[PDB]
Design an enzyme around this catalytic site. Structure first.
Site, short mmCIF file in Angstrom:
data_model
loop_
_atom_site.label_atom_id
_atom_site.label_comp_id
_atom_site.label_asym_id
_atom_site.label_seq_id
_atom_site.Cartn_x
_atom_site.Cartn_y
_atom_site.Cartn_z
N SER A 41 0.80 -1.23 0.00
CA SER A 41 0.00 0.00 0.00
C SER A 41 0.83 1.28 0.00
N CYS A 45 1.02 7.18 -6.57
CA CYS A 45 0.69 8.49 -7.14
C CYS A 45 1.53 9.60 -6.54
N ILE A 280 -9.22 -18.61 -10.04
CA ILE A 280 -8.26 -17.50 -10.12
C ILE A 280 -8.96 -16.25 -10.64
N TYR A 281 -8.88 -15.18 -9.86
CA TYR A 281 -9.43 -13.88 -10.20
C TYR A 281 -8.29 -12.92 -10.47
N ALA A 282 -8.59 -11.83 -11.18
CA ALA A 282 -7.60 -10.80 -11.48
C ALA A 282 -8.24 -9.42 -11.57
N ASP A 285 -4.29 -2.83 -12.81
CA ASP A 285 -3.70 -2.45 -14.11
C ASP A 285 -3.52 -3.63 -15.07
N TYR A 429 -24.64 27.09 -5.42
CA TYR A 429 -24.34 28.47 -5.79
C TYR A 429 -24.35 29.48 -4.64
C1 LIG Z 1 -28.37 39.48 0.26
C2 LIG Z 1 -28.82 38.27 -0.54
C3 LIG Z 1 -27.91 37.24 -0.83
C4 LIG Z 1 -28.32 36.12 -1.55
N1 LIG Z 1 -27.42 35.14 -1.83
C5 LIG Z 1 -27.78 34.04 -2.53
C6 LIG Z 1 -26.86 33.03 -2.81
O1 LIG Z 1 -25.66 33.12 -2.42
N2 LIG Z 1 -27.27 31.94 -3.51
C7 LIG Z 1 -28.55 31.84 -3.98
O2 LIG Z 1 -28.91 30.84 -4.65
N3 LIG Z 1 -29.45 32.80 -3.72
C8 LIG Z 1 -29.09 33.90 -3.01
N4 LIG Z 1 -30.05 34.91 -2.76
C9 LIG Z 1 -31.43 34.75 -3.26
C10 LIG Z 1 -31.56 35.20 -4.72
O3 LIG Z 1 -31.25 36.59 -4.80
C11 LIG Z 1 -32.99 34.97 -5.22
O4 LIG Z 1 -33.39 33.60 -5.03
C12 LIG Z 1 -33.19 35.30 -6.69
O5 LIG Z 1 -32.73 36.64 -6.94
C13 LIG Z 1 -34.68 35.16 -7.02
O6 LIG Z 1 -34.98 35.71 -8.30
P1 LIG Z 1 -36.36 36.50 -8.59
O7 LIG Z 1 -36.32 36.93 -10.03
O8 LIG Z 1 -37.50 35.65 -8.09
O9 LIG Z 1 -36.33 37.81 -7.69
P2 LIG Z 1 -35.31 39.05 -7.74
O10 LIG Z 1 -33.98 38.60 -8.33
O11 LIG Z 1 -35.39 39.65 -6.38
O12 LIG Z 1 -36.03 40.01 -8.80
C14 LIG Z 1 -37.33 40.49 -8.48
C15 LIG Z 1 -37.35 41.92 -8.95
O13 LIG Z 1 -38.69 42.25 -9.29
C16 LIG Z 1 -38.96 43.57 -8.88
N5 LIG Z 1 -40.41 43.75 -8.64
C17 LIG Z 1 -41.15 43.17 -7.67
N6 LIG Z 1 -42.41 43.61 -7.76
C18 LIG Z 1 -42.47 44.49 -8.79
C19 LIG Z 1 -43.51 45.25 -9.36
N7 LIG Z 1 -44.77 45.21 -8.86
N8 LIG Z 1 -43.22 46.04 -10.41
C20 LIG Z 1 -41.97 46.11 -10.92
N9 LIG Z 1 -40.96 45.40 -10.40
C21 LIG Z 1 -41.20 44.58 -9.34
C22 LIG Z 1 -38.14 43.75 -7.62
O14 LIG Z 1 -37.74 45.11 -7.48
C23 LIG Z 1 -36.93 42.87 -7.86
O15 LIG Z 1 -35.88 43.65 -8.43
C24 LIG Z 1 -29.64 36.04 -2.01
C25 LIG Z 1 -30.54 37.07 -1.72
C26 LIG Z 1 -30.13 38.18 -0.98
C27 LIG Z 1 -31.14 39.28 -0.70
C1 LIG Z 2 4.45 7.50 -10.71
C2 LIG Z 2 3.01 7.04 -10.81
C3 LIG Z 2 1.99 7.96 -10.56
C4 LIG Z 2 0.66 7.58 -10.65
N1 LIG Z 2 -0.33 8.50 -10.41
C5 LIG Z 2 -1.63 8.14 -10.46
C6 LIG Z 2 -2.64 9.08 -10.20
O1 LIG Z 2 -2.33 10.25 -9.90
N2 LIG Z 2 -3.94 8.70 -10.29
C7 LIG Z 2 -4.25 7.42 -10.63
O2 LIG Z 2 -5.42 7.06 -10.72
N3 LIG Z 2 -3.30 6.49 -10.88
C8 LIG Z 2 -1.99 6.83 -10.81
N4 LIG Z 2 -1.01 5.86 -11.07
C9 LIG Z 2 -1.41 4.49 -11.43
C10 LIG Z 2 -1.72 3.64 -10.19
O3 LIG Z 2 -0.55 3.59 -9.34
C11 LIG Z 2 -2.16 2.23 -10.61
O4 LIG Z 2 -3.33 2.33 -11.41
C12 LIG Z 2 -2.54 1.33 -9.44
O5 LIG Z 2 -1.47 1.28 -8.49
C13 LIG Z 2 -2.86 -0.07 -9.98
O6 LIG Z 2 -2.93 -0.97 -8.89
P1 LIG Z 2 -2.51 -2.50 -9.04
O7 LIG Z 2 -2.82 -3.22 -7.73
O8 LIG Z 2 -3.10 -3.01 -10.32
O9 LIG Z 2 -0.92 -2.53 -9.28
P2 LIG Z 2 0.24 -1.93 -8.34
O10 LIG Z 2 -0.34 -0.82 -7.51
O11 LIG Z 2 1.42 -1.67 -9.23
O12 LIG Z 2 0.52 -3.19 -7.40
C14 LIG Z 2 1.03 -4.40 -7.95
C15 LIG Z 2 2.02 -5.00 -6.97
O13 LIG Z 2 2.17 -6.39 -7.29
C16 LIG Z 2 3.54 -6.74 -7.11
N5 LIG Z 2 3.86 -7.95 -7.92
C17 LIG Z 2 3.83 -8.03 -9.26
N6 LIG Z 2 4.13 -9.28 -9.64
C18 LIG Z 2 4.37 -9.98 -8.51
C19 LIG Z 2 4.73 -11.29 -8.26
N7 LIG Z 2 4.92 -12.15 -9.29
N8 LIG Z 2 4.87 -11.70 -6.99
C20 LIG Z 2 4.68 -10.87 -5.96
N9 LIG Z 2 4.33 -9.60 -6.18
C21 LIG Z 2 4.17 -9.14 -7.43
C22 LIG Z 2 4.31 -5.50 -7.52
O14 LIG Z 2 5.57 -5.44 -6.84
C23 LIG Z 2 3.40 -4.37 -7.10
O15 LIG Z 2 3.83 -3.89 -5.82
C24 LIG Z 2 0.35 6.25 -10.99
C25 LIG Z 2 1.36 5.33 -11.24
C26 LIG Z 2 2.70 5.72 -11.15
C27 LIG Z 2 3.77 4.69 -11.44
#
Ligand SMILES: Cc1cc2nc3c(=O)[nH]c(=O)nc-3n(C[C@H](O)[C@H](O)[C@H](O)COP(=O)(O)OP(=O)(O)OC[C@H]3O[C@@H](n4cnc5c(N)ncnc54)[C@H](O)[C@@H]3O)c2cc1C
Ligand SMILES: Cc1cc2nc3c(=O)[nH]c(=O)nc-3n(C[C@H](O)[C@H](O)[C@H](O)COP(=O)(O)OP(=O)(O)OC[C@H]3O[C@@H](n4cnc5c(N)ncnc54)[C@H](O)[C@@H]3O)c2cc1C
Ligand SMILES: CC(C)(COP(=O)(O)OP(=O)(O)OC[C@H]1O[C@@H](n2cnc3c(N)ncnc32)[C@H](O)[C@@H]1OP(=O)(O)O)[C@@H](O)C(=O)NCCC(=O)NCCS
Ligand SMILES: CC(C)(COP(=O)(O)OP(=O)(O)OC[C@H]1O[C@@H](n2cnc3c(N)ncnc32)[C@H](O)[C@@H]1OP(=O)(O)O)[C@@H](O)C(=O)NCCC(=O)NCCS
Lengths: 555, 554
Positions: A41, A45, A280-282, A285, A429
């Protein structure tokens, strides 16, 4: 359940995951785990990061120790023990103790093979004499590379192979203050991603002063590895070399036992991980898996699958077969300096190889709401079926929020969702985290517009030929953005003026639209279509185009 | 063909529906009517502007009136309040906010997205409270910032500890203002459960917020500067923020005789249609069904309002209607260094509905622990023991919390069960996750309950159990006992337990606790296979000690 003797070959990702759950399912089973190396183990990577000094504590690489794990799970764990032969009709294996040179036979009722995959070592002239050439698989490999750096003070390193791990090696060598050249035979780093996505990665690597050599390979190693002669004819003077050209399954025990092999010499298994021998299973890689998307036989050497497989096998051995392995999706991720790069499912290259019709979209969207500090672009490429909305794969890159977007999309795919579902994922969001429509929603909307026929599109690699052939390209950016450059043949009508300048749009030519990101191009496409023009948007707009075809940019 | 579509409200729902409508039809006349000066303002950013985190006021305006009207050929009318719907004549009456003069406007289709307004309670002295503010729009925000600049308040009182109250707490605190939060309930943040709130409370206290629970304001005195609490306690304060919830702006609908729903919401069908076939309604103002149980509710959030707007535009001028399957209730807030997220239903609501559920609390690292700066992510998953249906989830921690909530919320909407969560293949490299993601981990723990591999008890059960004959074994290493133990615990470290089996009474019900719960589960598996009746304490000592710190024994 009747108790049995279960022998596990290999003690890392697959082997340790199956042994642990096997014990949780039975106190009575005898469980033996045989491992050729000193450690079970280990964090395979983590190895590049220990070399880079990012992981500072070697012991942190040990996820479980032999002592702790044998005691916790009552496991008979035998490190420095190599399985040299399977005797399947005898139902024993032959084990060599590497320390004492004693050999013995061990009987089993169930044999589990998780031997992994070994580095591909090319037959390059001079490779035998190359003193500072290294492969990376295990902890001893890691110690050796690190000792060489610490003791011999290399100033330049060459990395052969630009896969996810080659790339991580590039980063970690740079981190140590070593100058790096990366050599790749393909025209891009990272095979899992497509060419145009790789273009961004190349930019980020070159900005960290990595030399990238593409469509070249090592022809010879000269001067004891200090001189690298490239196929092309060029030469690299270097102080060390890391080979990262991929892996090959460790199926020699299988071949030796006459067990069936799958693609690329993997061990072949059925739906229950059983080999052609019932006892035998396998897993790991070493095995053939089906890809989740197309159910094509393949090999995908990743840790999540190895761990999932070992954990599922344990249940299966105990007759809990309600759930069987659904194949490997191929979700993967890498840190590339300041960038995160992720992939899941299939790329264009694989899909073309398989003759599968697809469409793609490239959508750039902020990691979180732009009115909140430190928002950064996340680029998502989504590949899908035009008729069904079936998702074939996705790729994502950016400085932050990339793992999150990939994980959502990867979840959607395994949940059998289509691109039409992605806009309906209710995600978290608030201003620090996302926008009212997450980038995942956004890419879903863009793909849905293609599926629903609200927009027709062309790719970065199609637009020039189209313009040569008489396509009429309208750049809907503001005139000032054209200083960044433009696609050849473009004519500028800013989006916000277009509705007032429709008389300038020819009604006798096929219209093509580009903006910067594609969004404003899409809005223009919608307007013109509604006005009865035949029109297509350039997917990803100029931003994408200029990244992948910089030499074609017109100023 | 052509239509005159009139949209009331120019923010989340109104601007979303309006922009998609145009993209669908160039022929329609589209009017958007807004009573305030601004459209598309960032309602969500307002607390962060007050806190000096969003430094630029202008960033709060996402689209301008002039740009949007131009881009989408929209007839956008700000400072215009719709005062009346005339559904028989298919007209509305609009009042110019500046002049008070009115005019009538005809519609083919009317869309109401009027939002919700602050709940203002009847507090004696609220009329004289100079420095009492509610927060909805940009003018409100300008007024609060102006008060802070002009009077330089030393102390602020926040009434109401929901996600928004808490945001205001942070933003005021980070300005150097002392803050007291006053809450009627026994916890902050109603959407999360009590034991989860316990972590939030600790964090807020560590940031010097005074927390006042199960209390309310009986009176405001000396013009708001003296806060008389029901407990008898008195707060001297320099300003108050009221954040005790919102109520739907449904007066137009009510006045036009449209059907109303829970909490006075505008009742709508699955296509956002009111009881009038030519008036539609979306946003905070409408009744929605919760996704999980399909119960009529009101969930005022931006993702829903934006989604409803795009979907409604498609209903009117798009293709095959997708129907709204309800609001899940996915939300998240930043709470100083913590992220807190929720989705679906919590225990309190499930209990109110008399729905049987189980829960699991799994703390796992944001990424592999062998890589630097791994931090805990605590996930609570609530589910049905028989079907494995997910009822809800809550999560908190410093990093990687939004990611885990998004995966789970995706899984719920995709109708996955807890049994599917271990099979989600997510992105793993050392900086990002583990070989089994926190999401996989919480799935496994829940699946072990569904499939009968382990039986469990809660933090709120264990003391009573121990009082009534339960034998509690703490399987932590002696070193981990530093922060204490559950009363009545007997230490047998996991790695010794198998050798010390004789010490375990075979005629008693055995209860197991660890630190985080994992090694307690391993011990429970062992003991079950050895024939003991055993249950694991969900969340171990870490959860227990966080929520019941006074009961900790040393
Ligand atoms: C401070 C704050 C932070 C928020 N942060 C997030 C967030 O991080 N993630 C998220 O998913 N949601 C967030 N929300 C909620 C998000 O703003 C609302 O879910 C989204 O804007 C809803 O869209 P809407 O069109 O229904 O209303 P709004 O975008 O409020 O638009 C409605 C508009 O209609 C206008 N209106 C209403 N009645 C009348 C009318 N009679 N005549 C003319 N115009 C009118 C209003 O003036 C308003 O401008 C946040 C809300 C607030 C207040
Ligand atoms: C440098 C490097 C970076 C990598 N980075 C990533 C990565 O970022 N993301 C990712 O998904 N994959 C990555 N990989 C691939 C990943 O390591 C392999 O997909 C994974 O280890 C496969 O597992 P395995 O058990 O099939 O073989 P291994 O992990 O190679 O294990 C097989 C083992 O069996 C032993 N063995 C073989 N034959 C015999 C035998 N006859 N008798 C006794 N023992 C034996 C070997 O010594 C070995 O230790 C990377 C590989 C390398 C080399
Ligand atoms: C912004 C707002 C006006 C909506 O306007 P909008 O024009 O739909 O803007 P969005 O960015 O949401 O929409 C992007 C559109 O471009 C498309 N798009 C985005 N990037 C694209 C790309 N690269 N290529 C092609 N299309 C793209 C999307 O598919 C979508 O179009 P569709 O709905 O026709 O499919 C409204 O949501 C708003 O007022 N928001 C802030 C207020 C708010 O939400 N407040 C609540 C409190 S925070
Ligand atoms: C660590 C390793 C041995 C797995 O052993 P394990 O005992 O299964 O350990 P895990 O932490 O994965 O345990 C998961 C179990 O604990 C349970 N669990 C975790 N937290 C829990 C909690 N708070 N409460 C209750 N149960 C919990 C899960 O339900 C699961 O149980 P199950 O498998 O019986 O359903 C194996 O993954 C390994 O060797 N990894 C490193 C090697 C590697 O992956 N290399 C590839 C290169 S990175």
């Amino acid at each position: 359940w009747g108790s049995r003797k279960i022998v596990v070959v290999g003690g890392v990702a697959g082997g340790a995951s199956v042994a642990a759950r096997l014990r949780r399912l039975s106190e009575e089973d005898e469980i033996i785990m045989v491992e050729r190396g000193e450690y079970i183990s280990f964090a395979n990577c983590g190895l590049p990061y220990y070399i880079g000094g990012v992981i500072t504590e070697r012991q942190k690489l040990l996820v479980q120790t032999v002592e702790r794990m044998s005691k916790r799970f009552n496991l008979d764990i035998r490190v420095l023990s190599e399985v040299v032969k399977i005797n399947k009709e005898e139902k024993t294996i032959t084990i060599k103790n590497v320390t004492t040179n004693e050999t013995y036979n061990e009987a089993y009722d169930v044999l589990i093979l998780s031997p992994g995959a070994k580095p591909i070592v090319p037959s390059i002239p001079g490779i035998e004499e190359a003193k500072a050439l290294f492969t990376l698989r295990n902890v001893p490999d890691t110690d050796r590379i690190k000792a060489y750096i610490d003791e011999k003070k290399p100033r330049h390193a060459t990395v052969i192979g630009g896969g996810f791990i080659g790339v991580e090696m590039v980063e970690n060598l740079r981190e140590r203050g070593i100058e790096v050249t990366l050599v790749e035979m393909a025209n891009q780093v990272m095979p899992p991603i497509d060419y145009e996505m790789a273009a961004y990665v190349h930019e980020h690597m070159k900005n960290h002063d990595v030399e990238l050599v593409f469509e070249d390979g090592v022809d010879a190693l000269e001067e004891n590895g200090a001189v690298v002669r490239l196929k092309s004819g060029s030469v690299i003077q270097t102080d060390m070399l890391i080979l990262a050209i991929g892996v090959q399954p460790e199926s020699s025990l299988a071949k030796g036992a006459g067990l069936a092999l799958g693609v690329r010499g993997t061990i072949k298994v059925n739906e229950k991980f059983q080999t052609s021998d019932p006892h035998i299973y396998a897993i790991g890689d070493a095995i053939e898996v089906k890809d989740f998307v197309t159910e094509t036989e393949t090999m995908i050497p990743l840790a999540w699958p190895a761990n999932r497989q070992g954990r599922m096998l344990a249940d299966i051995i105990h007759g809990h077969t309600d759930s069987l392995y659904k194949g490997t999706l191929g979700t993967s991720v890498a840190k590339v300096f300041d960038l995160t790069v992720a992939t899941t499912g299939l790329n264009e290259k694989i899909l073309k190889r398989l003759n599968i019709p697809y469409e793609v979209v490239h959508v750039q969207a902020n990691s979180h709401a732009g009115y909140y500090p430190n928002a950064t672009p996340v680029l998502i490429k989504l590949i899908f079926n035009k008729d069904s909305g079936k998702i074939y794969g996705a790729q994502t890159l950016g400085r932050d929020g990339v793992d999150k977007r990939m994980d959502v999309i990867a979840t959607a795919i395994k949940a059998n969702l289509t691109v039409l579902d992605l806009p309906d994922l209710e995600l978290s969001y608030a201003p620090p985290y996302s926008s009212a429509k997450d980038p995942v929603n956004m890419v879903g909307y863009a793909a849905s517009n293609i599926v629903d026929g609200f927009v027709d599109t062309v790719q970065w690699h199609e637009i020039d030929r189209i313009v040569e052939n008489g396509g009429y390209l309208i750049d809907v950016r503001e005139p000032n953005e054209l200083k960044q450059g433009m696609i050849k043949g473009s004519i500028n009508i800013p989006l916000d003026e277009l509705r007032d300048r429709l008389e300038e749009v020819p009604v006798d030519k096929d219209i093509y639209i580009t903006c910067q990101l594609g969004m404003r191009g899409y809005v223009a496409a919608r307007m013109l279509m509604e006005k009865g023009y035949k029109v297509k948007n350039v997917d990803g707009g100029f931003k994408l185009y200029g990244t992948v075809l910089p030499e074609r940019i017109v100023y």
